[model samples]
Target: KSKLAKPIQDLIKMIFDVESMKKAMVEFEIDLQKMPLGKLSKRQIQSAYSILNEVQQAVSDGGSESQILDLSNRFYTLIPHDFGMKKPPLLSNLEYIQAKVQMLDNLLDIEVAYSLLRGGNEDGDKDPIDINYEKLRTDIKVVDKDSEEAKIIKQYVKNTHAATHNAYDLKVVEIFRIEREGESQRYKPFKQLHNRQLLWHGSRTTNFAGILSQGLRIAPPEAPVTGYMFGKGIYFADMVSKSANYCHTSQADPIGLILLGEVALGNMYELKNASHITKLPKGKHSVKGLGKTAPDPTATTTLDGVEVPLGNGISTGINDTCLLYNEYIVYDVAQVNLKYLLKLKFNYKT
Candidate 1:
């Protein structure tokens, strides 16, 4: 009761990040001392306090997401699967680049033959000919009417990837159906008084992966976040993996982390027991050859030389997810879109 403003003081205490709020109040010049808090208008309060609250909420959300993303990246670079034509093994690095080439030609021929041979002479023909500007600019976008500029872009990126990696490649993956989905959430708050908003992880890739996982239900990212994947087109998954990597080409994609999250099927901190019909001991707890593993229905061990029919969820996402549950996390896999990983040959081992 030492404070004169009981309710306001209490409100301030509840929103402890008031220092930030105070700063904003000062900057915005909101006269809090004289303004009657008891009779403050909704818009007035929102303008003064809510404004800063929005910012703090923003900071909080961004901080959590930044933390998760950082953690995800750390985990992604630690897995050990590769070389399956689809998800080959990583031996080195990976990179993708996109570039635009200006055309001195038109849409029907945007993929025009550059007269690089002409020394690109300053078109000495006319000082400034009124050559139909429409015909002059070819639609590089219309590669083929079916038009998938997206693929073309990837090709342009990967192909032009620098040998320095702008040429990232590596991998020799093992096959095991660690088939499952995983999730993590983060919130960002700025000033303090409000819950500004939430930002979701797993954009394009997760979005598509989410679709592929139609039977299951998952939350969607924010509108801004969703937009990232909207234009990704067919290769949305790939786009998602390398969200921020675009700005940092030298940086690696986070697919490995997503894969890791996907595999996290059963744990208190994360998901729980979402694996297939089994478990496998892994790491330190695993049997000598098995390592400390989690529940594995299709797993096997020699008890006095007698074979066992371990578990059933062995080749499924469930198995992997369960393993993640058992071990919190593990060094899963790494894939650098380089060195052609091998093909996936299927055969029955009955």
Candidate 2:
């Protein structure tokens, strides 16, 4: 009699919440066929993800359930997020554990499959962290016999690869800049917060075996401003303001961006001389003289009518936009959900 096998149940059981669980499932590419028996059908897997989404809704609606604290503590027992000095701040425990587990799951989903299919090692490479699939096998042996989930599990083991993960593999979800109220009107509509228009692209690696350690997870900083960064992955920046008065120019703004073992630079307001800001071609687009603060009021800026502050180096005009390292300004955002999307990164990343 087919039933939802021990492994899938085992894996799903340990995760206390729906959002984390769903992320884990995607990371692992959990499948019906992977079960020793009672493989889940396509509809079952789809239904499971859907239900998990509802559970997420429930969590948001002031209804919380899950052993997050215990599960998080358990993960801490396995790995530590703190290494001091060299690493970024610290992942605490939950953030680090979540990152590790999720990255591992992501690797298993894609890397292991290809490796095993090619008669290579089941776990692939050994760079980021080595996953013990055999351990997973051990956890999955306690079978369920008379369960309804098993009935759905047994229907389509052959056709289940979890399409959702595939859909997001190379896609980019936008993270709009969060501005303070009516202050945002003066800025470009969909300009990325960072001069480099960073979004949550899939895994960092573009190979048979990729690194699971660092993902493009953004988090609100412990700092004063309102920017998000590699809260979970490897990039972060401070928020921008229409009035540069609240801004911190030069290294004061603090940019935690790009490569792990590299420099943690500053931003446009912070590093005006080096930050990436471009002008869209039009009738006239140039920042001319300095504002009232200028040494020479006679030496005004390019765009006259608008007042341009000197030391505070951020401009929010109709024609100026931030250009990411790659990709042009291809996506747009509605004003309503602009700030909402900023918080979305940290929520989903962890």
Candidate 3:
């Protein structure tokens, strides 16, 4: 009543001046209860309603605009999800990369040769690179024109992966599967290294002990940091592990952390550490031993004539002072003209 203008207030007074119209106004209020009030319908039931009861008083005391507009804005944004509306188009990270690579429509002539190589599928909708070995091998055998192609690929992969486990390669080979019949495969070269883009991890060495156990003493760093270049080949640094007395050459692969107070069989000096070019921060003081003394099987105590087992005195110790470093992100680009370097190794004929 106080919110109305004087003219409207006078008119409403005359209309409500009659008892019949007064009752009709009461009826109108009841009908208004059933109508859905956008945004307001829910808020009136929420805790905000309790506070809104004092809105009139708040307005007199410098309260800002009512929440009606703000609340409606939020409600409208959610309408798409509420009405089962169509979703907007989207592309995943890898898809975006591939789309950009093939967007120009003109393909270049590119051929790559490497000790460890995987095929690429221009037809794949998502990942074009072939990482799934089983399907790649099986499908190539079934579809490829040359029978010896599959054999050559298998032998090449096996020879290159002399020391490393083919876990990742085995899983990724399926990406190369030729789904359509009689679809020929082609190779293409990048316009240049500057034009090419690659998101790759660093190369790492295989577990030497695992290969040696299988009577294979030779294992190369069968990891390609990035795909091969047209003429230039990939370059990698020699990673070797060294201790005070011994040293072994290998790939500088990323490794996980060793927990403190763990039961390691070897001495601290015997465990090989990675070679670093820069000084790393020394790690904090910490324990590195079996929390308790190791139990001696041969040594037994006779208490009440029952053979009781006892452990050697606590032999646990620490070797906590050492420089430590961590690796989180790796970046590299291998674009070289290998063709210009090699004349004896003719294009792989087999």
lDDT (tens digit, per residue) of candidate 1 on 221-335: 1111111111111111111112222212122321211121122112112333322111334422111112122224333332222222222222224432322112222111210
- Expressed as tens digits, the lDDT of each residue in 22-136 for candidate 3 is 2322322312233221222222222222222233233335444544334333323322112135443222222332232221110110001111122342344432222222212
Separately for all candidates shown, the number of backbone clashes (residues 3 or more apart, or on different chains) is 87, 19, 15
Please write out the lDDT profile of model 2 over residues 62-132, one tens digit for every residue: 44345333333433233223333553322233334344433333433333333322333354343111132
lDDT to native, each model: 0.22, 0.24, 0.21
TM-score of every model? Answer: 0.16, 0.20, 0.15
The candidate 2 region of ten consecutive residues with least summed lDDT is 255-264
How would the candidate models be sorted by TM-score, starting from the highest? 2, 1, 3
